[PDB]
């Protein structure tokens, strides 16, 4: 399996399996864990050998079918197929092997059916003394124990080759809001700002855009294809207008270029100054603020417009 989206999450809750054996890969994090390739391996294994699907336990099957390697990258899954494969009378379909030249190495389709010796005497093309059938068949009976019941087994193995990853399923999504500071994550773009409708003119191959100095301004959501502007919401320093601790204690605080509608209150060119009343008069002030507006203490802090003379 390559270049496909894996729905591992639905597998855990769609039904119940027999076992789920993972080593080095956490089960719940398979949704965001990434490999390069996925192998779907089809298995038919006796119930007694279900626990024997592990490196260390062998038998008539695990010693000659496909030896389990020490480099497993994946997990085993099996389920009960008694209602589909178990019946009174038995089944004698799937093949055995008694002895061969050597044990089959991991991942070697030695499907061939050559003649091999269990002892040392030659066969001469005729099976007999120390030359037996290298093929037999299963046997499963529901009247027998749990270890003599048929099963269907599917085991996944992965790869981590020197190639870009291709098989991961991002079942992650969130709604879209606007005109609020949101820590958005748009296909890898992480930042903070307010989403607003734009009037730009994109081309249908451009994920996003940046105007000047490598700063992102418009981002295109890859679900409904709209261009959304990006703006970092209001910020700025805070300055305190004080007449000194010895003189008095009442103070007025400034917010640089911040609209107080988003935070007496007086609106100035350098942000809404709060804590001081605006007087219609105009005196020779002492504490400057900006854009011709100032402040002075004479029994509360009051703001004026500068009187040149």
């Amino acid at each position: 399996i390559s270049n496909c989206v894996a729905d591992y999450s639905v597998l855990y809750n769609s039904a119940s399996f027999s076992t789920f054996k993972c080593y080095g890969v956490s089960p719940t994090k398979l949704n965001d864990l990434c490999f390069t390739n996925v192998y779907a391996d089809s298995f038919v294994i006796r119930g007694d050998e279900v626990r024997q699907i592990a490196p260390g336990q062998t038998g008539k099957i695990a010693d000659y079918n496909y030896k389990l390697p020490d480099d497993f990258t994946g997990c085993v899954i099996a389920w009960n197929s008694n209602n589909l494969d178990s019946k009174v009378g038995g089944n004698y379909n799937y093949l055995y092997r008694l002895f061969r030249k050597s044990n089959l190495k991991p991942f070697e389709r030695d499907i061939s059916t050559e003649i091999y010796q269990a002892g040392s005497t030659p066969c001469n093309g005729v099976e007999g003394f120390n030359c037996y059938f290298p093929l037999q068949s299963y046997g499963f009976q529901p009247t027998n124990g749990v270890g003599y019941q048929p099963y269907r087994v599917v085991v996944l193995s992965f790869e981590l080759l020197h190639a870009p990853a291709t098989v991961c399923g991002p079942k992650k999504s969130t709604n879209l809001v606007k005109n609020k500071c949101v820590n958005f994550n748009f296909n890898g773009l992480t930042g903070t700002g307010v989403l607003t409708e734009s009037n730009k003119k994109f081309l249908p191959f451009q994920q996003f855009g940046r105007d000047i100095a490598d700063t992102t301004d418009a981002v295109r959501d890859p679900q409904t294809l709209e261009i959304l502007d990006i703006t970092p919401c209001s910020f700025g320093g805070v300055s305190v207008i004080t007449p000194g601790t010895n003189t008095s204690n009442q103070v007025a605080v400034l917010y640089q270029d911040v609209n107080c509608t988003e935070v007496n209150v007086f609106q100035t060119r350098a942000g809404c100054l709060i804590g001081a009343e605006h007087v219609n008069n105009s005196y020779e002030c002492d504490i400057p603020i900006g854009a011709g507006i100032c402040a002075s203490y004479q029994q509360s802090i009051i703001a004026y417009t500068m009187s040149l003379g």
Epitope: L95, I111, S112, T113, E114, I115, L135
Partner: nanobody, 116 residues
Framework: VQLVESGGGLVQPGGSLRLSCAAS????????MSWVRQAPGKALEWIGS???????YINPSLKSLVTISRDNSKNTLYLQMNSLRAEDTAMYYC????????????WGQGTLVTVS
């Protein structure tokens, strides 16, 4: 055609019928030949298995009842059934590489096995 089958029609119980399974070349004969049945409701039952290595391993209660003969001119297989029963009454297939699943195999035209 790469793989085909022949013979069939109506099989007389007790007698011998020379069934056939032709093909185009021996290079396509990896790795198995098999004449099987898929009865309604019955599980997988395989009546024959001719192997690439010139081996025929059959159910011990069937291999005595079955004669085996393999050809290479037309790459046909000769198999004879006697004392027929109604459990074989299905679309009798000649499946080359039956154990290799339903993608590396050919399903023949089919025939029937009926007992009067």
């Amino acid at each position: 055609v790469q793989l085909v089958e022949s013979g069939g029609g109506l099989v007389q119980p007790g007698g011998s019928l020379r069934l056939s399974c032709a093909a185009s070349d021996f290079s396509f004969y990896d790795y198995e030949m098999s004449w099987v049945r898929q009865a309604p409701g019955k599980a997988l039952e395989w009546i024959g298995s001719m192997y690439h290595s010139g081996r025929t391993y059959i159910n011990p209660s069937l291999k005595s009842l079955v004669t085996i003969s393999r050809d290479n001119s037309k790459n046909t297989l000769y198999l004879q059934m006697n004392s027929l029963r109604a459990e074989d009454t299905a679309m009798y297939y000649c499946v080359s590489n039956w154990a290799s699943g339903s993608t590396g195999d050919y399903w023949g035209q089919g025939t029937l096995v009926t007992v009067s």
